[PDB]
DNA sequence: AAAAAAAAAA
DNA sequence: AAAAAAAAAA
DNA sequence: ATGAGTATATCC
DNA sequence: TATGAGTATATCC
């Protein structure tokens, strides 16, 4: 791979500088993807002075900072810098403290420090500490304990080098160490003396300071290099104490972050988000009711003008104090909520963007007990104050006002940044926000929780970035959330609810990143259509836009054309073969089937020995006593060490598990051992001692790496060809699987080599192996048994959630786990969900690219795996024409059992959808009683939904309702495959928004429009003409989704009623001008009447007792509302028959069943017309 | 052991080791759970951290214990003293172990031997009196400097969980018995006027250049400022805050503030003192078994939590009084009297403290000490008989 | 050392002026010298002699000639104002007939230092009532 | 119906 | 003057 | 900015 | 009544 390519890459994603991009580059492994990033890296950094650079990688094996230094010395031809101060190693506490012990042992310490006594009892002190540390390093909780002596004896010997560095410039030390005797800070000019004088002291002590502290000048390193667990994490900056973080420092603005496993990254940031969720819990109501404090505070001009001005002009602001005082009167906030013990575990309540979910089963329940002034919290049926109404939009309150905050503190931030002479001690975005919460009185713990529920993601507020950023993933936008509800002495009189918010999905945190930084993502996997091991790209794409360029675009040809080897193996006649290893209940068919055995009952002893071993599990009762499946892996495994017994071929093999032969019946070494020892001399004469096995494992009391190297060494010259057992995790990419070639391998091996390379590189002059055992890969789903609101449990609904945003699970399926689960039963692994299979064929991939990283190589490549491996492979969503030739045949293999994703997935995005829009309408029925702009947003959505129901993507996506909403909020339109008019659904529960669309019962379509049933009356067509209405769908790509479709028809023949209402009985029904009316009819009249419209069809499975309740329901709320004595007329359009209205016994209510008839002509008798108008008039 | 050397990390070493030894504790509460047929995980929780066991099961564990061999009972009852410790009548211990807690067997959470219910109608036997004063002092004086608080916080939170009392936003429990006294409603009448006269509603913001701001001393004698010019403060309108600094301009009289609000503070946290008083005996006649109950310290940390406070401001505060409130009028006995004005005031620190994460106010962390060994050994007094021995026990000194 | 000067104050040992000079003394890193007259130093130091010399007092066998070997500061810190001297140990009563070449006069200091204490405390009180009056 | 004790100035 | 999305019931 | 010169004990 | 079936890596509190 070219040089030149990456600089161009690098050029182009800094010439994005004031919208950031992010570019992914997929190369297959084993090409040069780290090394020349590496080159360009250094080459644009010695070119150009402002550049800054972030290589993050995911482990710390991957830094590869001596690759950094050559590249610097290679690229360096003129002043040849000492790439300390140039390029930094951000490395952690524990790593920082043992290079300084290292260099205290082996003298390593320039002699400036050594010499002195204080540095001197730091460092001995510091030794101490560590070994305690180390000594320490089994539990976890108690881990942050060891870290923070840690911590201190670390800082005290920075104190000691600040105080040499002191006296040895003349600085007033003395300033800070008289005022400063413990928190020692210092102004910056001292720093800046310090910094020059250490800038002309000689190379080697500088270079060691330099080395060792990367942080001691780090606004002149232009790369670092750090793992992703440090960059999501914080540095602490030399003269401080203080630690800050990576992601709200300066040092990022305009960088360009370099990931070097891309798809692996999510993984790591996305626990590290869970665990920081759970570390960060408050007291739901004292949170609230002090956050309403602090904004009453403010808006009563008590705290400074300098915020005051910025707070009170805005709209938003009265909006919110509103909001909060109606939320603290109708939930009785100001109160204690008190929970009697419940004896058993209270268990815990859950919110996810689909529902709410209760780990006891019983819904909470809290009601006003006005003698005991308190909120009783608990099981009883009583609830008046909505808890589960409760939790939801107090959370909804707090992240809106933390966001309103959130952009106060930024022109706090801003402005106070302007004022200040020197720019080397601004405050971040961090310490703003942390400063206006406490203005308002509110505690550290209350303030964190609060700035981590948006932390500072605003998104860009100008209205022409030239791409609309939309989503409908739900998960992304609104996270979940956990509730626990716990009584304690020391607070007798109240329960507190304590809140755990989950916001931040790594996609996001990427976005986040993405508003500041450029970021290049390298990987060889780093567009695998999965979202469990990779980001969301689907949503990335959606909200980035042309912001996620392709690195791909930039890659000479020439190398493009290199990325292809099945040409390769073909010229030097490579076969690959792979065969399935076909098992059943006992070793009938790992045995050879050829006639040459020689023991008959031997092999009945090893049965009964398996089932003797498969037998003493004591485990779990299903599955055969969990004995079926583990012999079942025994045999296939047995398969797999008789095919590379039989071959002398073979130089070496690598049969991947996915365990580690332990101690229990599951996987043991010894078994395994002495079956190999069998049946090397069970079978074959030269096989026996040819053949051998050796096992790497972390169970072992020596590294990984180095015992691979000694196997492979033991076939390169002990002259035995070795099997190796291993697992898919102990032994993955950035590991070697490469030998010198034997004599063996001399004489059958052939060189791929490309052009314009000598014959002595390091990827010539050594060779690859002979081919793989593949076992089923597990775990991609997290089957933690005991759900409990802890890292396990976060994880598996995270999971799920992902799964349902993709479009891969739908509704009934989520509700069925949800329920699984709250009964600690684990339900069926999807098996259409497309992420799934992606990530298997992932890991398989991961495991097959080790064996691609040198020329020469040796032919007949023999693949060995079990059948169910078989089944669970994939080439969807993966460039097959690109990969590895060894996964190329194996999808080949695969070609008879591979399943189709297509019509599920698109079945499940049409579920998805509907569902989405329901719960969107849902929402909207819940808050437009309030507010009067989002009726302003519904009203032009209802509209826009026939204006013109099939749209295409362009002119959806440039409108007027999906253009302003930043979401596609209740415009989840369908997808027409065949650009088709009309379809059929099958409804299974309507007031749960969950449709079959493989099914029959609602056909929607023209039939429920003008054009039928209704045109054909006067003066009703001619208005939906003059209205934009058109009355025939044309054939273009998106379609209404039932829940949509359902406004459509209510919006017609609501117009139509209204219309037909006022053409028979002559008067103008007048709109419901009071806000609060919402919700509570469709039209008034003469102060007493009230008129409802609807455009149900024919009689449904309805009873009249539902239409009974309503109506008293709404009347009782009429009657609270509007101060009289109101009467209701309810209207059905449509009737085939004669059905007259039926009138109550004492005539208090009017429900007239039928109007017009399916042609469009009027229906109802005369006299019934004269019986409406004088109940009309009374 | 080896983290031995620095105080700092003393702190987090013995919570390592105190974690240590409730594992071993709770080892030992399944093996003899086990033994004696308790579902101790029905009634722990079947998940972790729990092991709240019933008066029952434990009974049981105890009456196993009782009926254990005797070797097997005797290691058990010396190494956990407090594996029951309502049977032992002398307990031996250390002055520094008696003012610190004890940590009941089958619990997590120690329980200070101070507001334990062993102590009530006991015979203390200080053998070192009058060498324990010391002693006593000494933890003290370690005490006071680790509850700090922002004095205008807390004024202003506590003045906040008060009105909150008198609008009856409290359930009626506390709320009938704060509101029929006049005391509240003067304690309320003189947390307006405080509010009111300093401008305890805005953000005092003190600026410094970088120098050393030392601190504020209170003793019953006088003020002390530990670095000459005296504190100043006035109302910035312009600004909207109370700027403090060593300008001559004085309109709020800082140095009459600072010791205002202490001497409010101390009188409010003695009226709820009595008022968590009256709420843990009414309480505890509703416990059936009086085994569980709750103690003065308890009912204190309630009501500060009730009013809203955090759980540092109701350390604080509570402290500013532990649990002292005199008899009633001696029965007409006997009058105690005294003119030693430090043992009835103590004395107070006040330190300033501007950072940037609170950048837009400065932090008075008040330090109070009024517990003298002298007030701790009365109020020992108000609940046990102490006997002194020592040949120097009378001493003038 | 703040709470110890509070408590000779208390107990009538130190007047106004002297906790005064001291806070000062501490305002400057100054510290001023040990009251000459307070009571109570010399009874603490006599309180750890005496403590001392009562571990050579637990047995009815005593050598005949017993020898007691100090500093001359020990001999003039030692003090016998408050102790009952009668009922303590022979040892301690020949070291004080040994030391009685330094014996202080200690009850009017005292009686002239709680006169002045007195007076202070009544002039604070009647500064406070009359503010808050 | 049992809250305390609050000068300036050095 | 760019804060969000809230129903029941299982 | 001089007077004066410590060891013992135990929870967060 | 109902499933899937690990090892491993890294940093701050
Ligand atoms: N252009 C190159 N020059 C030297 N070595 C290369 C080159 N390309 C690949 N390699 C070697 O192949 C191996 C893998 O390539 P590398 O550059 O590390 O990227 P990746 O790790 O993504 O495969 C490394 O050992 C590397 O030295």
Redesign the pocket.
Known sequence: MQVSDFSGMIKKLQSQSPEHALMLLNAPTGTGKSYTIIRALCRYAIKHENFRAFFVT?????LKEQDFEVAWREESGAVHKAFSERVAVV??????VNKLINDWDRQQIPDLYRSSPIFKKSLENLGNAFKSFGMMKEN?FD??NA??ML?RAEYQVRRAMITILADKAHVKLKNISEAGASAFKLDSISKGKIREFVSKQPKADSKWLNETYPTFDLEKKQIII?????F?????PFFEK??K?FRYSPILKDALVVLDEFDSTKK?IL??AIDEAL?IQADLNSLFVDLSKGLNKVNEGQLPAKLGKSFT????????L???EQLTAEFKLDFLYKMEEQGRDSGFVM?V??????SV?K?WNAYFDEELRQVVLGRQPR?DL?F??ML??I???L???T??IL??AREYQVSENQKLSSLDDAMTIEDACFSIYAALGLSKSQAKILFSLGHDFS?????KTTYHAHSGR?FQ???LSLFQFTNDPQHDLQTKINACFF?ETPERYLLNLLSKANVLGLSATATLPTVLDNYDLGYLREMLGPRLLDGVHYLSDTTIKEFDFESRYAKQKIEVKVETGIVDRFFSEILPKNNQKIDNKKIWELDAELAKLVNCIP??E???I?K???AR?YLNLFNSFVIFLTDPSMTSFLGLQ???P?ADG??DENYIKETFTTLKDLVGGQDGVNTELRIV???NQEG?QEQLSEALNLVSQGGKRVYILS????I?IGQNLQHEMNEFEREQAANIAPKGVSKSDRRQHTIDLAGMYLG?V????????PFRMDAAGLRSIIEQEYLFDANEINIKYL??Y???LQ?Q?????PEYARSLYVSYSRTIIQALGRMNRSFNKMPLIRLVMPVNVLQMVTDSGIDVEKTSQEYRCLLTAAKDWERDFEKPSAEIAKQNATFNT???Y??V???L???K??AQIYHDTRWFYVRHPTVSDKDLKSSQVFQQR??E?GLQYLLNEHLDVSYEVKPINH???QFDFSGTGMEVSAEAAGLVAMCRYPGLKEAFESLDIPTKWEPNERILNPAQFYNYRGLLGEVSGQFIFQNEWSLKLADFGKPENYELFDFHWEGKVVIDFKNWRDAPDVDTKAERQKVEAKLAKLQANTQREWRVIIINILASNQTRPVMTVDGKILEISGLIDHQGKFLLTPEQKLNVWRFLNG
């Open positions: 995911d482990q710390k094996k991957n490395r952690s506490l524990e790593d920082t976890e881990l942050k870290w923070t911590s750090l793992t992703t667990a440090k999501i994490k914080s540095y602490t203080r630690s973080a790591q626990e590290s570390k002009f805005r709209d938003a602001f009265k909006e919110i509103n909001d909060a919110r963007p689909q529902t709410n979910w209760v089963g819904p609830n909505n589960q109404r939801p939009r959370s909804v309150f992240k809106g006002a966001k309103f952009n106060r998104s860009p507020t100008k209205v739900r936008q609104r996270g916001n485990a779990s299903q599955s055969r969990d079926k499946y583990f892996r996915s365990l580690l332990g599951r996987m494992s972390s169970r990984i697992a898919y995790q102990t993955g089923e597990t775990h991609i789903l997290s089957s933690n048994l509700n069925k949800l329920k699984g009964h039963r684990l339900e069926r692994h329901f719960r969107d849902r929402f029925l819940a808050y009683q309030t507010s702009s989002w930043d979401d909020f007031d749960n928004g």
